[PDB]
Structures are given as structure tokens and as C-alpha cells.
Amino acid sequence: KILHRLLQD
Amino acid sequence: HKILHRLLQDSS
Amino acid sequence: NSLALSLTADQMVSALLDAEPPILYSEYDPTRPFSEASMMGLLTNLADRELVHMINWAKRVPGFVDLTLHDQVHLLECAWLEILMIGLVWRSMEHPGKLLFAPNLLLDRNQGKCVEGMVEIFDMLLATSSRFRMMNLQGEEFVCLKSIILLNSGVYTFKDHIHRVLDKITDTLIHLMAKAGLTLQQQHQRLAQLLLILSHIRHMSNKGMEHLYSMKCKNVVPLSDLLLEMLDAHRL
Amino acid sequence: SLALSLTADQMVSALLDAEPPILYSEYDPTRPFSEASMMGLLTNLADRELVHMINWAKRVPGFVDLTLHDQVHLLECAWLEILMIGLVWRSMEHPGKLLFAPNLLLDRNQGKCVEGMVEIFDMLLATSSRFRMMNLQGEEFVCLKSIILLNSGVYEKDHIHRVLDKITDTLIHLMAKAGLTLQQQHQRLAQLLLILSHIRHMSNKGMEHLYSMKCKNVVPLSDLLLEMLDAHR
Ligand SMILES: O=c1oc2cc(O)ccc2c2oc3cc(O)ccc3c12
Ligand SMILES: O=c1oc2cc(O)ccc2c2oc3cc(O)ccc3c12
């Protein structure tokens, strides 16, 4: 998910 | 008119 | 001026304990398994009967009597399902995997699947119940939290009476925790933990309120006029 | 975890320092308010606020120690709550008005332009009045907002509650420092935390409202917003 990406990056 | 009204006035 | 402000913590506890409603029973029909309609029928029938006892429980909560009829109605309309839920969660505490709706109606999570959208509600309730269990929630604390729900849930949908009485109940909770031997730090930490639970109970109520509305539209369960009016107050 | 070893002063400093900026809206004053345009402004603002929220949450002491799936879960549950308590805080000294953005100040009657919205406005406005009467302090607000983040989806989890206790320790420290007696401290703590119940209620309502507007196709919802909405559906 998009939220996963932002949290990860 | 409301049932809740009756319950509150008549509560025991 | 209200008699509620002059009460001591002990007198506050005693009044609340003495105000507790009875544990009502459900149908003794041992016909298993449940259909969706029969289960919903049991829950709403039980809820209907518990509401009547809730009403005079409320009128025995210190301060509530000093409220106008309209204000009393608003609070009950706003909090009634929360109050049913925290009662359920309390009764279910010593039953780790199950929900004690009534002494003869003890349901597990899997039985929630017999009603659509109910299993998600069962899970939240069970989680709240286990939470209360791990925290070792005491009866005296429970009744404090339940009355708090009554006075707080509708207070912003209307230095005033209700908040002064809420402050009283807070003092009572602290008094209980000190009496139980907790340090000051432990006292306000436990106080915080308990009040945050109320946020979740609020969440569950909103899910349950929506679910009840849908069954009303589904016309599966015949809902009582009292119950319908309580549901109409939340207006979806 | 290095969040458990923070003094209350350090907890406050970290939280204050991590604060996101106050974003502006794409408001065009000349454009007459339609339902679609107003909803567009609100959701577009939310969309840009989410990104700052994500980077804010990572700086909330303890949140970083959580796994990625858990970090996702917490933000999914609490994002509208966090948007709302922010709005309420920004609107404290604007009675009868909600400061969505410095250039987007809306009163009750304008909420009527969007169906079902004014009831949400009323609840927000009342929360703002409550904070105002309580004289909510900045240091308290950031503690509350961080509490929401860690609390809303919590129902490992033991670490989450350790941090939550830490923030309670912080709130109490703030109150003791402002001169409140012990009784006043526990009372104010309760008043503040009971607010979180109503913020939850509002979020539940707004979430349903947002879902209805999507099915109404009135406002184009951002992909991120459309995923944050499927978390509750
Ligand atoms: O969560 C509950 O807790 C209770 C506790 C009681 O003591 C009595 C009834 C209920 C009850 O009836 C429902 C109907 C729905 O459609 C959804 C949820 C519930 C629900
Ligand atoms: O209550 C709110 O508070 C906010 C605070 C912000 O900083 C940004 C956006 C919002 C926002 O967008 C919505 C859309 C709906 O359909 C319903 C309610 C809201 C809502």
C-alpha cells in the first residue's frame, strides 16, 4: 500500500 | 411523544 | 445545588454499587445452532429489557437526577449501546474466549459468524474483555467507568454540573486505586489506561449502531419501538 | 527502545519539535462555494496533510520501534482523528469557526453547503469550545495527539502501552509544573482523555461521511485517501 511505502522510505 | 420520556418519569 | 458534590469517595462507590442493574436472562430454547434472525432476536430482546433497568440505574447515578428531562434523554440516547457493551464486556471477563450476553447465553467468536458483520463486533468486544481481564479491572472501577460513559458521551452534543460530577467520579477512581495500594504514578497511569478504553468502547458502539441500523433495514429482527427510538437518535 | 528512557521534559521537546507545518488550502476566494468545490478543498488539504503526518508519526518516540505492518495499522485507524484534533486545536481562538487552513476559515452555515457536514462541524466546533474553556496548552495538545496515534488501533502491544504510560507521566508533569494540585492534576488528565472519546465519535462519523461522498462521486479522492478510507471499510 501507499502508506507502507511512505512509512518505509 | 417518547417512550424514553415515560421510563424516566416512572423509573423505580 | 446537587447532593452529588458533597458525597465522599466511599459514599460515591456505595451509591454506584447499590445502583447496579440485575443480570437478565435470555430464552432457554436449547435449539442449536442459531439462525441469523434467532440470534439477532435474542440480542435485541435482551437489549430491550436491559434498557428499562438502565433507565432507573441512570436515575440513581449521583447528579443525573439533577438534570432536566431533556438532558437526561440526550445522554441516554447517546450512550445506551456503550453502556450495554461495557456491561457485556464486564460480565465476559471471567470467560476469556466467550461473550456472556446472559448467564444462559454464552457465545464464542465463531457464533458471531451466524450473523453477517457481527463477527467483527464480537472480536472488538472480546479484545476489550481480555483487556479488562489483564488489567484486573475491579467491580468498583467498572461502575465508575460506566457512569462516566453515561455523563460524558453526550456532553458535547448539547464549570457546569455534569463536568463537576465527572470530576467527582475521577476522584473516586483515584481513591479506589490508592486504597488498592498503587503509587501516585501507578494511579494516574491506570486512570489513563481505563479512560482510553472508553475511546474504543465508543468505537464499538458506532459499529454496533450501524450494524443494528442495517438489520433494521434488512427487517430480519422485529425491533421494539423503544429500541427503534433509541436507534433513531443517532440518525443515519 | 530509547523512548522509555526519556524524561518528561525530553518527551515534550521531541513532540513539539516533530510538529508538522500548518498547510494552506488551494482556496480561490472568487470561486463560489459548491458542495463539490468545498469537498475538494477539504480532501485535497487532507491528502497533503497525510504526508506530513506520516513523517510526524515516525518522530513520535516509540512509533519507530514498531513493525511496518503495525505502523500502517495505527495510522490507518487514527488518521482522521489526528486531522481533526489538529483542526480543533487550530480553531481554538476562532469561536464559531473552523480553521481548516489559514486561508480556509469556515463557520457553521458554510458547512451546510455540503450535506451531512454541518452536524460534523457542530461537533468539531464544540470540541474547540471545550479546549478553549479548558485553556488547552500546546504541550498538552501534542501529548494528546500522540496518544491518539498509539491508542486508536492498539486493540509489542506491551511496548505501545509502556510508551502510553510514559505520555501520561508527561501530561501529569506538565500539570504539576503549571501549579495544579494532585487532585486538579488527575481531574484535568481525565477531562483531556475523555475528549478523545468524542474525537473518536467524530472520526467514525467523518469516515462514514467521506465514504458516502466517494460513492456520490462528488469529489475526486486521492489514491492515498482512497486507501486510508478502505482501512475502515
Ligand atoms: O454489542 C452488543 O452488546 C450487547 C450487550 C447486552 O447486554 C445486550 C445486547 C447487546 C447487543 O445487541 C446488538 C445488535 C447488533 O446488530 C450489533 C451489536 C449488538 C450488541
Ligand atoms: O472533520 C474533518 O477535519 C479535517 C481537518 C483537516 O486538517 C483536513 C481535512 C478534514 C476533513 O475532511 C472531511 C471530509 C468529509 O466527507 C467529512 C469530514 C472531513 C474533515
D6 vs D203: CA distance, rounded Å: 31
Largest CA distance in chain A: 13
Asked if residues C166 and D194 have their Cβ atoms less than 8 Å apart, the reply is yes
Query: At which residue does the C-alpha cell 448539547 appear?
Result: C158
Atom 19 of ligand 2: nearest residue by CA position: D206
Count of residues in chain B: 12
Segments in C2-138 forming alpha helices (H): 9-19, 36-58, 69-91, 119-134
Exposure pattern of C191-215 as b/e (b: 16+ CB <10 Å)? bbbbbbbbbbbbbbbbbbbebbeeb
**Which residue of chain C is at minimal alpha-carbon distance from B1?**
C229
Q: How many Cα neighbours within 13 Å face the side chain of D112?
A: 4
Known binding-site residue numbers of C: 50, 91, 211
d(CA C230, CA C74): 10
In whole angstroms, what is the distance from residue D11 CA to residue D18 CA?
11
Instruction: DSSP letter for C107, please.
Output: E
- The three grid cell numbers given for residue D16, joined into one nine-digit string: 513539539
The experimental technique behind this entry is X-ray
The helix or strand, by DSSP H or E, that contains position D98, with its residue range, turns out to be strand D97-101
C232 and chain B in contact, CB less than 8 A:
no
C-alpha to C-alpha distance for D208 and D119, rounded to whole angstroms: 13
User: What is the rounded CA–CA span in Å between residue C143 and residue C6?
Assistant: 19
Contact flag C199-D204 (C-beta cutoff 8 Å): no
Rounded-to-integer distance, Cα C196 and Cα C219, Å: 35
Residue nearest atom 6 of ligand 1, based on CA coordinates: C84
B1 in reach of chain C (CB within 8 A): no
CA-closest residue to ligand 2 atom 6? D83
Alpha carbon distance C221, C42 (integer Å): 9
Of C27, C207, C17, nearest to C102 by C-alpha is C27
Q: At what angle do helices C69-91 and C119-134 cross, to 10 degrees?
A: 80
Strand partners, D97: D107
> Are D220 and D40 a contacting pair, CB within 8 Å?
yes
| Cβ neighbours for C74, distance < 8 A, ≥ 6 positions apart | C154, C157, C158
CATH architecture of D1-233: Orthogonal Bundle (1.10)
What span, in angstroms and rounded, lies between the C-alpha atoms of D26 and D104? 9
| C32 vs C9: CA distance, rounded Å | 47
Q: Which three cell numbers stand for residue A6?
A: 511512505
- CATH of region C1-236, choose from 1.10.565.10, 1.20.120.1200, 3.40.630.30, 3.40.1390.20: 1.10.565.10
Query: Quick check: D182 and C185 CB within 8 A?
Result: no
Chains touching chain D through at least 3 C-beta pairs below 8 angstroms are A, C
Residue C236 is given by DSSP the state -
Q: Is the peptide bond before C33 cis (omega within 30 degrees of 0)?
A: yes
CB C146 within 8 A of CB C137: no
**Rounded distance between C-alpha atoms, residue D61 and residue C147, angstroms:** 34
Contact predicate C166/C79, CB 8 Å:
no
D35 labelled ligand-binding: no
On whether any CB of chain D is under 8 Å from the CB of A3, the answer is yes
CA distance, residue C28 to nearest chain D CA (Å): 33
Q: Give the Cα separation of C211 and D99 in Å (integer).
A: 34
Whether residue D81 is annotated as binding a ligand: the answer is no
Could C191 and D190 be called an inter-chain contact, meaning their C-beta atoms sit closer than 8 Å? yes
Name residues whose C-beta falls within 8 Å of residue C42's C-beta, 6 or more positions apart in sequence: C26, C27, C34, C101, C105
Residue ranges per domain, chain D? 1-233
Number of continuous H segments (helices) and E segments (strands) in chain D: 9, 2
Task: Give the best residue of A1, A4, A5, A7 to mutate against chain D (max D CB count within 10 A).
Answer: A7
Handedness of CA C137, C142, C146, C152 (dihedral sign): negative
From the CB of D46, is ligand 2 less than 6 Å away?
A: yes
**Is any atom of ligand 2 closer than 6 Å to the C-beta of D86?**
yes
Asked if C124's CB is within 8 angstroms of D165's CB, the reply is no
D interface mutation test: which of C195, C209, C213 has the most D CBs within 10 A?
C195
Distance from CA of B6 to the nearest CA of C (A): 10
CB B6 within 8 A of CB C66: no
Amino acid code (one letter) for D206: G
The H or E element spanning position C100 is: strand C98-102
